[PDB]
Amino acid sequence: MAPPLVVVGSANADIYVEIERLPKEGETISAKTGQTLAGGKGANQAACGAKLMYPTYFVGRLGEDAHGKLIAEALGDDGCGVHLDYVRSVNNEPTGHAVVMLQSDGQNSIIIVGGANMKAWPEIMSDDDLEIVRNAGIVLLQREIPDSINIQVAKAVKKAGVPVILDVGGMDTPIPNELLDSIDILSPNETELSRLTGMPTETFEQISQAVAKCHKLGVKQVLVKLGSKGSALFIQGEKPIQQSIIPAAQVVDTTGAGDTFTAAFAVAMVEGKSHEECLRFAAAAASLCVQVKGAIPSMPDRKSVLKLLKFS
Amino acid sequence: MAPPLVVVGSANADIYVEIERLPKEGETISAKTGQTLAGGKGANQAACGAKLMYPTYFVGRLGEDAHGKLIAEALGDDGCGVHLDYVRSVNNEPTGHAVVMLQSDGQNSIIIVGGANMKAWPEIMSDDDLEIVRNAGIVLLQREIPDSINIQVAKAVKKAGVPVILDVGGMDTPIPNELLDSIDILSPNETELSRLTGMPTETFEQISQAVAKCHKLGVKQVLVKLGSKGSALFIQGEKPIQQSIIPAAQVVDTTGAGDTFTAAFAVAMVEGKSHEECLRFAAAAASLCVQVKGAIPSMPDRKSVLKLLKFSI
Numbered sequence A: 001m002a003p004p005l006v007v008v009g010s011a012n013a014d015i016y017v018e019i020e021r022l023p024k025e026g027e028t029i030s031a032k033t034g035q036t037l038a039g040g041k042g043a044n045q046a047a048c049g050a051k052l053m054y055p056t057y058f059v060g061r062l063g064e065d066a067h068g069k070l071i072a073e074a075l076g077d078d079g080c081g082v083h084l085d086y087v088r089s090v091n092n093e094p095t096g097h098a099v100v101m102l103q104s105d106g107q108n109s110i111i112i113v114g115g116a117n118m119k120a121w122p123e124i125m126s127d128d129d130l131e132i133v134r135n136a137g138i139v140l141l142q143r144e145i146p147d148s149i150n151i152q153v154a155k156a157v158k159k160a161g162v163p164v165i166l167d168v169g170g171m172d173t174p175i176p177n178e179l180l181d182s183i184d185i186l187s188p189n190e191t192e193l194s195r196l197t198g199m200p201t202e203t204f205e206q207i208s209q210a211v212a213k214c215h216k217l218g219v220k221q222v223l224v225k226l227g228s229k230g231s232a233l234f235i236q237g238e239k240p241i242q243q244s245i246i247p248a249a250q251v252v253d254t255t256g257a258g259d260t261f262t263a264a265f266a267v268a269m270v271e272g273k274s275h276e277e278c279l280r281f282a283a284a285a286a287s288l289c290v291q292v293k294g295a296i297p298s299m300p301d302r303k304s305v306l307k308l309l310k311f312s
Numbered sequence B: 001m002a003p004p005l006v007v008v009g010s011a012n013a014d015i016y017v018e019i020e021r022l023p024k025e026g027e028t029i030s031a032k033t034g035q036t037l038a039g040g041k042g043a044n045q046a047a048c049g050a051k052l053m054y055p056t057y058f059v060g061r062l063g064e065d066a067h068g069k070l071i072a073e074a075l076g077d078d079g080c081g082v083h084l085d086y087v088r089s090v091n092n093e094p095t096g097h098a099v100v101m102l103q104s105d106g107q108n109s110i111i112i113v114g115g116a117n118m119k120a121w122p123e124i125m126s127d128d129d130l131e132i133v134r135n136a137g138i139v140l141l142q143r144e145i146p147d148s149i150n151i152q153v154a155k156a157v158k159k160a161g162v163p164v165i166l167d168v169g170g171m172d173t174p175i176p177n178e179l180l181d182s183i184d185i186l187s188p189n190e191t192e193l194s195r196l197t198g199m200p201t202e203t204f205e206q207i208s209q210a211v212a213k214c215h216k217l218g219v220k221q222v223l224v225k226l227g228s229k230g231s232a233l234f235i236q237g238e239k240p241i242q243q244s245i246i247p248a249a250q251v252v253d254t255t256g257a258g259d260t261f262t263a264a265f266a267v268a269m270v271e272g273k274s275h276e277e278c279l280r281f282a283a284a285a286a287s288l289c290v291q292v293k294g295a296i297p298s299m300p301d302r303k304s305v306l307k308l309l310k311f312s313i
């Protein structure tokens, strides 16, 4: 009954097919194999939070189709234990999905269908949806749903005094200043930090500088994801702190690990942990995540993260 | 219950994405929209039979997943009314699926995942897997499950005396002669007939000679689908029967129409109708199919097929 993690964002069916080579206009080919998996940054972050045994709601839009049931199954009672009260399904849009064509040479080809993620939201968020974010302990957004929705959520949480984190992952359009001005923590990776600031991010000094531009744009806190280099938390009026990776024994699959990092950070934060302990909690979670194939099935339970953290 | 139509074959979730152009290696693109629908040649044919009010069983393999559920729902008691007793689901293979990339010009590019359709069958069919085919009034196969399974089913019927139809739709591989020798009716389109015989099929004379080649490969009856030109039924030693299309008011989506044609022909044949009547009935059912989007959603009910027959000649 603690103030919940509330994730508002995307849910996707990820349709992976293993093919020797791409087809041609008319060519029917046969994949070696194929699998369809629950994904999307919003669903991933919600799954992570629920698996960490923190009360978590997902606010998203699905189609009334098989891929929608796939997501609900993965996230809900028989899966991760996300509260799905505020997920709505519609009959005029497909569940969002991605066709991923892994090829016999190492190259990926992807078709992304935004579907319900981009087209099933209302013009104006319902009072019901806004009520769950007002009652949240913390709110997580990404950029795989319309700016309109992110902005309306951001405004409500700001008035309610609820912290909100915006993951920059998703579409590569500019971020509206009204969104930047209404969020507590911006969370880009190195490449995303560069794209929105038009500055280099090859060195930590360059990163600090792009982050300085972020402060000027209205963002008091930036949680920078650095891949193998770990992460860095920048708070205006303070010294940037850093956390290196907690090295994985083996990197099986980095899919979902940035989402795990972000959501785990949010869980540690809302649990009242220090900034240092938040970064380390998140590092530990991302680390367990990359050691296992897949996205949502790779995400660690609280017991495993805490176990890994114990090590000296 | 009349001796049922028994369809042994494939079930696919059909994943349609509308794009402008096919993407390139390393490249991410966006689609305008999409839809996931119940399909597969086997499930389509069973759905058709069931909608035409003939007792119909589907024998097939599904994964225990959301795509599998989609199929079951579309075919079963709340959908088409297919008897699903002999559908089996496995947890170690995915339900087969097909990514169908529609382009703006008109071409389609397709990736087919065999999944449970190709990989979840036993090496040897058990005799109570085969009990249903032994009780059939007519059996329909396609080429979207393993050759080995098709061979075992056909042989189990031949040694029981009921007609077996093999739709050539599916894999583009040569058909094993062991299979051709065990079926009663082969049903290819023009391209499949040409691929299988290695002969041209651009003219009716050519088609007739390609069919003569089929008669040499041991097949007595060939039901050739000729697209906008209609169809024809060749029976060895007899004059061919030709049937033009029953023209559709509008063509919305031809997906599943060949499946409809073949299954409707089978229903008419198992009900005792004349070859002429069988072809007409099949043409009418395919006509209705092309006027609605989707495969299984577009299957017509028997009354509509008979009404189109009444008023079309």
Ligand SMILES: Nc1ncnc2c1ncn2[C@@H]1O[C@H](COP(=O)(O)OP(=O)(O)OP(=O)(O)O)[C@@H](O)[C@H]1O
Binding pocket: A169, A188, A189, A190, A225, A226, A227, A228, A229, A230, A231, A245, A246, A247, A248, A251, A254, A257, A258, A259, A261, A283, A286, A287, A290
């Ligand atoms: N060998 C590793 N061991 C432990 N953690 C790792 C390892 N490699 C990457 N990570 C961590 O897993 C997460 C995902 O890394 P990844 O490189 O895929 O993306 P990122 O740049 O960090 O962030 P984003 O998801 O926004 O792209 C990150 O939190 C990263 O710190």
Ligand SMILES: Nc1ncnc2c1ncn2[C@@H]1O[C@H](COP(=O)(O)OP(=O)(O)OP(=O)(O)O)[C@@H](O)[C@H]1O
Binding pocket: B169, B188, B189, B190, B225, B226, B227, B228, B229, B230, B231, B245, B246, B247, B248, B251, B254, B257, B258, B259, B261, B283, B286, B287, B288, B290
């Ligand atoms: N305008 C139309 N009106 C009525 N029937 C049509 C029309 N166009 C195609 N058909 C019929 O729908 C069925 C499928 O037609 P299509 O052209 O898609 O391929 P086909 O070669 O005949 O069969 P297959 O699906 O096996 O390739 C056929 O029975 C065809 O005769």
Ligand SMILES: OC[C@H]1O[C@H](O)[C@H](O)[C@@H]1O
Binding pocket: B012, B013, B014, B038, B039, B040, B041, B044, B098, B144, B169, B255, B256, B258, B259, B295
């Ligand atoms: O004939 C139609 C079927 O062929 C392919 O198998 C598609 O899945 C489609 O439903």
Ligand code: NA
Binding pocket: A253, A254, A255, A256, A257, A289, A290, A291, A292, A293, A294, A295, A298
């Ligand atoms: Na992973």
Ligand code: NA
Binding pocket: B253, B254, B255, B256, B257, B289, B290, B291, B292, B293, B294, B295, B298
């Ligand atoms: Na159709």
